[PDB]
């Protein structure tokens, strides 16, 4: 039962995520910093699928060996999880930068810096993974009955997770800080990302609404005064929207508005409306082209952000229950120990996470869809 599902999930991990690594290599279209991060995460998934499943299946029954080796068997999954969480945080930061500040996105994001951050986060993940090895372990604590049952020699120690790895260390430091604080920061980042996109779309629509309504009032107006009032709002909206296509269009538009305002200050309303009709051409052409490009660009950014948010949510909801039951067991010693059959089920769910990643990229991103069908 348990042995069957672990092997079944393991096989889907390699072949499922090797395509994601394969796709980034045989498709120049899908190659950027976000893909570099997600392929680092995919390499972490490859590593967990290849190694942790045999490690879990051999530690589930028992494999007596040196205490350091057994501790490594248990910390390898944790380091491959910390790598994934760091990669997800980097992805979230990349998306926030790209959407909030598109002008400086290319300036502040570079491939060399992305590779450097990937290396830094991987070695940092190794730091947490190897932290229990050095000094913080439970090797010194005797288990007489156990070591007699498995026939443990002096050098070799039996493998039993909860009694070989520091439970208090795990529950206190491993969960709280380096899981949650990344998760809370990531949630705040995603909320900020969506708020920024909504605000930007609202601002563009408001500027278009002003540049249309004021013009309509211009033809539907009279006795100057209102004309000079409306062109002031036109200038304000045009400058705000501007802050070769966009620049030249807005320069021509503000020049025409200045001409109309200068010609209407003298009191010549007929040619004031003539100049408004003159505006009506540049408005249509350049402003409509700019708006149609901007809306599609923002929609694409929002779609990418939603995809990555879904990946994050799946990661969190797959790695949450195990830690929750672990901290429940730690903080209620008087409570009866959690059932073995349920604990194994939760571990299966956690490892399942690696399988889920390629399915999202094969179902939502059309760029990966074509190349997977190619294979
Ligand atoms: N609680 C736990 N158990 C095991 N394996 C030991 C299975 C077991 C659990 C309870 C029992 O009474 C006898 C055996 N691996 C485990 N890995 C983790 C883990 C990975 C990341 C965070 O926690 N927790 N965890």
Numbering used by the authors: 8 to 250, 267 to 398
Publication text:
However, applying it to GPCRs without signaling proteins remains challenging because most receptors lack structural features in their soluble domains to facilitate image alignment. Although integral membrane proteins like GPCRs are challenging to crystallize, a highly successful strategy is to engineer a fusion protein replacing the third intracellular loop (ICL3), located between transmembrane helices 5 (TM5) and 6 (TM6), so that the inserted fusion protein can mediate crystal contacts. We use two model systems for this interrogation, the adenosine A2A receptor (A2AR) and the Smoothened receptor (SMO), both of which have previously been interrogated by X-ray crystallography and cryo-EM. By exploring various fusion strategies, we determine a 3.4 Å resolution structure of antagonist-bound inactive A2AR in detergent micelle and a 3.7 Å structure of unliganded inactive SMO in a lipidic environment.
Finally, the crystal structure of this construct revealed that the BRIL domain is rigidly linked to the receptor 7TM domain by two continuous helices connecting TM5 and TM6 of the receptor to the N- and C- terminus of BRIL, respectively. We initially attempted to determine a structure of ZM241385 bound A2AR-BRIL by relying on the rigidly attached BRIL domain (MW ~10 kD) as the sole fiducial. Despite extensive data collection and image processing, we were unable to either identify clear 2D class averages with sufficient clear structural features, or generate a reasonable 3D reconstruction, even when we used the low pass filtered crystal structure as an initial reference model. These results suggest that a BRIL domain alone, even rigidly attached to the protein, does not provide sufficient features to enable particle alignment of a GPCR. Following the successful strategy employed with hFzd5, we next added an anti-BRIL Fab fragment to enlarge the fiducial marker. Apparently, the larger fiducial marker successfully drives particle alignment and yielded a reconstruction with a global resolution of ~3.4 Å. Further focused refinement improved the resolution of the transmembrane domain to 3.2 Å, sufficient to enable model building. The cryo-EM reconstruction of A2AR-BRIL/Fab is almost identical to the X-ray crystal structure of A2AR-BRIL, with a global root mean squared deviation (RMSD) of 0.9 Å. The ligand ZM241385 is well resolved in the ligand-binding pocket, demonstrating that this strategy can enable visualization of drug binding. Furthermore, we identified a lipid density with two aliphatic tails and a polar headgroup between TM5 and TM6 on the inner leaflet of the membrane adjacent to A2AR, which was not observed in any of the previous 58 X-ray and cryo-EM structures of A2AR in the Protein Data Bank. Based on these results, we conclude that a Fab tightly bound to a rigidly attached BRIL is necessary to serve as a fiducial marker for single-particle image alignment.
